[PDB]
Write a protein that binds this ligand. Structure first.
Ligand code: ATP
Ligand code: ADP
Ligand code: ADP
Ligand code: ADP
Ligand code: ZN
Ligand code: ZN
Lengths: 716, 183, 561
């Protein structure tokens, strides 16, 4: 109907749109009609309709300036509606762009605008752009202000105020707010959650009146720093079109005593007075830290004022409060109950596709060279948040500048445009930037996604089926459990010799049910025990709840399970709701050393043995670790697998690594002497000559004895 | 309204707002830096600097300068807010309608609509700075009234406002005539 | 006597709307449910002093004034206070904790002064000092000058208020011990009320109260939801309903065009909450009341447990007779025993015995699991033993079940517990029941007279008890017709209750596995004997023989001694 296709208009007029005759008949439009056109980002404009049969039915033509104003590209769909109630502009104040007006003498108004508006009746709306082509020059302008507001028709008698200081162009670009969803990638799940939690209360309030419920108000986002929380909040606010009222934490806390409270009160009052609105309290942890932190009165009055304001807004006002904190435990506990920030959202490091999306988003203004393999960079960047990727791009560009610096005269302040053209980033530059990268997200526990199937784990079919029936069935067929009245099992404990690949089994289990994975290695547990860490077990389980369905993994639990930490872990495990799809998987090498309390029913009761890989399993592991390596044609690893009886997966990795080391040594020696694109069987034999088992016979016998004891304990 | 309010006021306010009033200062003998680059003592003095006023025997700060101080103190550009009006006239009257669940003041009150304790304190900014009588006759006649009759008098004084160069961003009310109401 | 004031709107289609038959305050007693006893206490202590002040003149007494409500957050303390205030229809001055605390220095005290003065001027008045802890925390928490000026001003105003004026002060605080101890003396907040999590009937009432406006579908079984929801405070139930409605609208979003500002009226009128939405909301929700000790009721009778007939009789003689017939105890002048200590193999059902004892005397049940004891021992638990016993006293009659004494009784905690138990009032019904698997490890000091001296052995289930337990566990599961269990019960000699639970759970797991396989193939509506046999092929005892011999030897020692 009104979803007209966008196309480039022949005319250069800034307020003229050509439409097809068929569409004109459908919409009952006519030549010269002023119509309101809406595109994307809620952008709107006023265009004079002109019949044009050249366009295909259902298509319209607009010029470059109108498309730029509408923030839309050719081929999109725009909605055109009648605008019969547009009045003549009583007074329009307009200012030019400085860079455009450079080199112009005389009165700009007479030169450009006076012929442009006389006998033109061009509709003008605030925030629009119009370009005047006079003589040999072309100058753009802005619709700074219109009376009556917000738009009106510039008639012959309309007064135009061109007086005013030039407007810098840098503000429009470098201040690129109004960022849409297209500027956020790799976090579609959390973006969808925030959208479904914010848009519907504001865009369609009548829904909840029809259902007769009070929609949730508070929202609390948290995650590692640099994951785009502020960017997501800004994008949601801009798309929703609400009265955004960004509030910073450090900014509020930097005011004199007795002023931060006033700022908070004024902010909340203005947000209420202009409903609907969206208040974003950035870095709330800087306003209301944990109780054990600063006890100063100035640090308590602000928290009390914030609590009072949060409790006082419960009314028919459309106010939504969004807060961002690095960790959930930093905020005062009082801010996590009903009527307050009761809804939580967790941001985690992206996967390969997310990193690719981030790279493409950032690497659209770069003058990249042809040899770009963004997929390769995404594969080789693990654990990078968006900020790290942006820094990587900046460093790569700086490296390219350094490389091209040879053709630059530093003393001279002007650089040849030819040299500027030659600038282009290359894959080597990105590799160097990675070499100079300093990721820091992984220093703490963070939600992440894994993509391991039942192919990187060789053999162990019975274990695979046991894990499937333990985990996958509850998630996919909970209705059956309800029908039979059986509560799903919470977690399991993997025990066995080191290197059996327990982490791989955990990752596979997480992948099958499409669940986020959280890892807690031994050093993290020790740091928590000493109390010098930035996070605590309660925080870990809160994040697990927030990012459900999650899978928490503990490694070498025997170090702490040899106790305050174990008590906290038991309390948290008992606390969690059974229905929540949260699974705690523990890995250890000395099960008998584990505290018996951990093994009680209702806890990590199920005990699963992870045996060493067998011949076929070893062959599969070797083939898997060598899939992306150039091997000798006609080479067979069956003999090597047969000869490696009793070796663990880590041992096979070590053998392959030594073979690769010998291959690279030989290749480098040959190149220096100057061939060997692959690895010959002699390298594998040399590597195997140094093979050494990582498991002693006594320990394996002890594991077998423990397994036999466990089987006897269940054999009657 | 997504920014500062839109309204037309006296010309004096507009012209004063256009200026910035910075008081330049030259290289102090204590500076340690080349010709270009100002460290801490060579920087321009803001118009609201209390030290300058009290050093020049001026007891108040020329309200427009106070407005500049308030604007500078907050309202970062391009981000950080959507504009908060910096000036608000205090009101002490109890909100007749608060209704968190209570009834109006006559028979019910909460702690949210209770006028908090008022802390009286001498104001620091005076709106109009210098009152100026055009001619000695304008007030000489007024005093002649008392001379002749012996009784007191009272009369409004019409006039117009303008800049006052002698004070940073100061205003002066020039009175033109005096009209005596029936009293 | 008892709840005598409850027996018999808001002082107020057009006529019905006018008579009440966003800011819809004045929520009357109708808008509250599941807390009948506490509401009755509050009404008795508030209305009569104000509504009918001449009774006290006729009898000649000074009515108590200070009333202190405390309970887990979200139980509706503010709702109860506001409802009572609106029902009484008296000058209602409301003061919040943080609201006063957010004022400048020197202005958070003048507000209290003017509040009390105005309340006195326009008597009768009711003052609700919400979140009193924020303005009067524990003495050690705050050392700043202002944090003591405010408390001193509050105390002075409270002491000066005690007079003929018909003014009553009500305060709310989640933690009873958080308040400054000086605020709990005579002439101050003396009378204390405890709010506990609701039971099944309370949950049903709350759900009905909240679920009166939603477009509920016909396939709604609020009784089932009330049965399943355990430990859900009223706030949690409201959040559950909101989440269910959100899920319903999300499911219906397919036909909803978000781009259009308005929506088709048919779609808006077609919204309906289904039972599956409530189940999903239950899955998403996460209660937090149980994280800390709370007061709740139990409904276990002498039928969900098996055997132990002599033990049941002993417990009855110990607890029931003092509660039901204190007159004869006074006649003989013998005070009832205070506590009891259950010992025996794990998994015998000591918790069920404690719950049954609590139910028989119709007393509220408080529990303290092992992790709670460890947390208190490490001094990182918000609550405290003194707090536990204060809540028990406030909610008398009560049964306090201290589980796994061996962890702490392997001591500061033991000393505190002994002092609290010794200080207990003789005639007040505050029973203590201890659970431990290692009687020897327990500190002997606890076993002295006037303490947990009455030791009771809990033997392993017998054939009859095993069969009864197995029948009870399988009652709510679809079983094959004519499915016998006596053979399984006989074959499970020496099995504890946990073992039978494990067996039945594995049988159900096999049944659901087979059902899933059949559904994927396309059947298995029951749990046939084959599943039970398959599970039994792997089940085995969980108690070693030496442990049983040690328990028998200890029992023989006790009997001989
Ligand atoms: N009978 C009831 N018991 C508990 N909650 C109820 C009941 N009826 C309704 N509710 C709901 O439970 C929540 C109770 O909110 P309320 O503010 O009273 O809790 P609170 O924790 O006592 O408050 P406060 O912040 O004053 O300590 C509200 O959602 C109320 O709608
Ligand atoms: N999709 C994205 N996810 C994460 N970061 C992104 C994304 N797109 C861009 N970025 C960049 O990552 C950074 C995110 O900053 P952010 O962590 O939100 O700031 P804050 O510290 O205020 O939370 C910015 O440099 C932003 O440009
Ligand atoms: N099927 C498999 N069995 C055992 N190990 C494997 C298998 N597939 C891969 N591996 C390798 O085993 C290693 C396990 O490392 P590590 O976590 O230190 O030991 P574990 O996983 O046994 O705790 C991984 O680096 C991985 O490359
Ligand atoms: N008569 C009984 N004997 C043994 N166990 C029972 C009996 N009745 C119920 N049970 C089961 O015992 C379990 C709790 O055991 P209990 O002894 O109360 O706690 P614990 O095992 O910690 O001592 C429950 O899951 C319940 O199903
Ligand atoms: Zn200097
Ligand atoms: Zn009020």
């Amino acid at each position: 109907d009104n979803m007209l296709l966008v196309d480039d208009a022949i005319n250069d007029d800034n307020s003229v749109i050509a439409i097809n005759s068929n569409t004109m008949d459908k919409l009952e439009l006519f030549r010269g009609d002023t119509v309101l056109v809406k595109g994307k980002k809620r952008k709107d404009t006023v265009l004079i309709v002109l019949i044009d049969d050249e366009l295909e039915d259902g298509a319209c033509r607009i010029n470059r300036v109108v498309r730029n104003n509408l923030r839309i590209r050719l081929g999109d769909l725009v909605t055109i509606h009648p605008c019969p109630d547009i009045k003549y502009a009583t007074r329009i104040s307009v200012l030019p762009i400085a860079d455009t007006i450079e080199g112009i003498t005389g009165n700009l108004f007479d030169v450009f605008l006076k012929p442009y508006f006389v006998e033109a009746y061009r509709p003008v709306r605030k925030g629009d752009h119009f370009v005047v082509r006079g003589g040999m020059r072309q100058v753009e302008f802005k619709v700074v202000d219109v009376e009556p507001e917000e738009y009106a028709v510039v008639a012959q008698d309309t007064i135009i105020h061109w007086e005013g200081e030039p407007i810098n162009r840098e503000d429009e670009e470098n201040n690129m707010n109004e960022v849409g969803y297209d500027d956020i990638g790799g976090c579609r799940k959390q973006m969808a959650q925030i959208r479904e939690m914010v848009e519907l209360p504001l865009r369609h309030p009548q829904l909840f009146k029809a259902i007769g419920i009070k929609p949730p108000r508070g929202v609390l986002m948290y995650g590692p720093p640099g994951t785009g929380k502020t960017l997501m909040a800004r994008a949601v606010a801009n798309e929703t079109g609400a009265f955004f009222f960004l509030i910073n934490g450090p900014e509020v806390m930097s005011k004199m005593a007795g002023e931060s409270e006033s700022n908070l009160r004024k902010a909340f009052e203005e947000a209420e007075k202009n409903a609907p609105a969206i208040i974003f309290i950035d870095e709330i942890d800087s306003i209301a830290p944990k109780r054990d932190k600063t006890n100063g009165e100035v640090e308590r009055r602000v928290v009390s004022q914030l609590l009072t304001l949060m409790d006082g807004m419960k009314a028919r006002s459309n106010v939504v409060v969004i807060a961002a904190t690095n960790r959930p435990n930093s905020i005062d506990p009082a801010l996590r109950r009903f009527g307050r920030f009761d809804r939580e959202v967790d941001i985690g490091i992206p996967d390969a596709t997310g990193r690719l999306e981030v790279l493409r988003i950032h690497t659209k203004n770069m003058k990249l060279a042809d040899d770009v393999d963004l997929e390769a960079l995404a594969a080789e960047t693990h654990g990078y948040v968006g900020a790290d990727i942006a820094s990587l791009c900046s460093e790569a560009a700086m490296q390219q500048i350094r490389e091209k610096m040879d053709l630059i005269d530093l003393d001279e302040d002007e650089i040849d445009a030819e040299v500027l053209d030659s600038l282009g980033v290359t894959m080597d530059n990105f590799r160097f930037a990675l070499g100079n990268s300093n990721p820091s997200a992984l220093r703490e526990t963070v939600v992440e996604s894994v993509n391991v199937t039942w192919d990187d784990v060789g053999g162990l079919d019975e274990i695979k089926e046991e894990l499937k029936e333990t985990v996958e069935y509850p998630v996919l067929h909970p209705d059956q459990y309800t029908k039979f009245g059986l509560s799903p099992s919470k977690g399991v404990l993997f025990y066995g010799p080191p290197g059996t690949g327990k982490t791989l089994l955990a990752k596979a289990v997480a992948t099958e049910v499409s669940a986020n994975f959280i890892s807690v290695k031994g050093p993290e547990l020790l740091s928590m025990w000493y109390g010098e860490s930035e996070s605590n077990i309660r925080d870990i389980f809160d994040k697990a709840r927030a990012a459900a369905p999650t899978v928490v993994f503990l490694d070498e639990l025997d170090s702490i399970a040899k106790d305050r930490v174990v008590n906290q872990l038991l309390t948290e495990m008992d606390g969690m709701n059974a229905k929540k799809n949260v699974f705690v998987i523990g890995a250890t090498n000395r099960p008998d050393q584990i505290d018996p309390a951990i093994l009680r029913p209702g806890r990590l009761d199920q005990l699963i043995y992870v045996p060493l890989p067998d011949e076929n399993a070893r062959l599969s592991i070797l083939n898997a670790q060598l899939r992306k390596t150039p091997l000798e044609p006609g080479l067979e690893l069956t003999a090597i697998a047969k000869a490696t009886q009793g070796f663990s997966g880590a041992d096979l990795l070590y053998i392959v690594q030594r073979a690769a080391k010998y291959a690279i040594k030989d290749s480098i020696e040959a190149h220096r002497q100057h061939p060997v694109p692959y690895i010959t069987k002699e390298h594998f034999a040399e590597a195997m000559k140094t093979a050494k088992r990582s498991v002693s016979d006594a320990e394996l016998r002890r594991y077998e004895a423990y397994s036999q004891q466990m089987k006897a304990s269940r054999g009657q | 309204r997504y920014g500062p309010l839109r309204i037309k006021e006296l010309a004096v306010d507009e012209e004063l707002e256009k200026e910035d009033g910075l008081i330049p200062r030259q290289k102090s003998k204590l500076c340690k830096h080349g010709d270009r680059g100002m460290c801490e003592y060579c920087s321009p003095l803001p118009p609201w600097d209390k030290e300058y006023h009290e050093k020049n025997k001026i007891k108040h700060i020329s309200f427009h300068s106070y407005l500049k101080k308030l604007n500078e103190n907050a309202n970062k550009k391009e981000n950080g807010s959507s504009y908060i009006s910096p000036l608000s006239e205090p009101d002490f009257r109890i909100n007749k309608r608060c209704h968190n669940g209570h009834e109006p003041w006559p028979r019910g009150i909460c702690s949210k609509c209770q006028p908090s304790a008022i802390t009286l304190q001498q104001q620091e900014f005076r709106m109009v700075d210098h009152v100026e009588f055009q001619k000695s006759e304008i007030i000489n006649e007024f005093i002649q009234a008392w001379r002749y009759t012996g009784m007191q008098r009272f009369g409004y004084m019409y006039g117009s406002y303008s800049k006052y160069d002698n004070t940073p961003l100061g205003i002066k009310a020039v009175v033109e005539a005096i009209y005596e109401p029936p009293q």
